[PDB]
């Protein structure tokens, strides 16, 4: 990791830094669970 961060095959003694640490997400989620207020189309399409 520190070899390819410095773009070299050799490293000298010392302290270095690399790509920062991060916890990746795992799943995916959604919203708007309750849906109501359906449009009154039945009487339009099924009136006697």
């Amino acid at each position: 990791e520190t070899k390819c961060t410095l773009k070299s095959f050799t490293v000298e003694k010392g302290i270095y830094q690399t790509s920062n640490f991060r916890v990746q997400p795992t799943e995916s989620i959604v919203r708007f669970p309750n849906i109501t207020n359906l449009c009154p189309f039945d009487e339009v399409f099924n009136a006697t």
């Binding site: 830094q17 790509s19 920062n20 991060r22 997400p25």
Partner: protein
């Protein structure tokens, strides 16, 4: 850290940021020189005996 500050938690800037190449790897070398040099100043003020 250049990656998180600009386009953290993003998989779309990750590849896109490489299009600019060698910007944010240049900044780290600039600040790392300052931080390393900071300890030297305290060395020159107390470590005389």
């Amino acid at each position: 850290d250049c990656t998180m500050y600009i386009c953290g938690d993003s998989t779309e800037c990750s590849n896109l940021l490489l299009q600019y190449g060698s910007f944010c790897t240049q900044l780290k070398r600039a600040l790392t020189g300052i931080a390393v040099e900071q300890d030297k100043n305290t060395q020159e003020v107390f470590a005389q005996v």
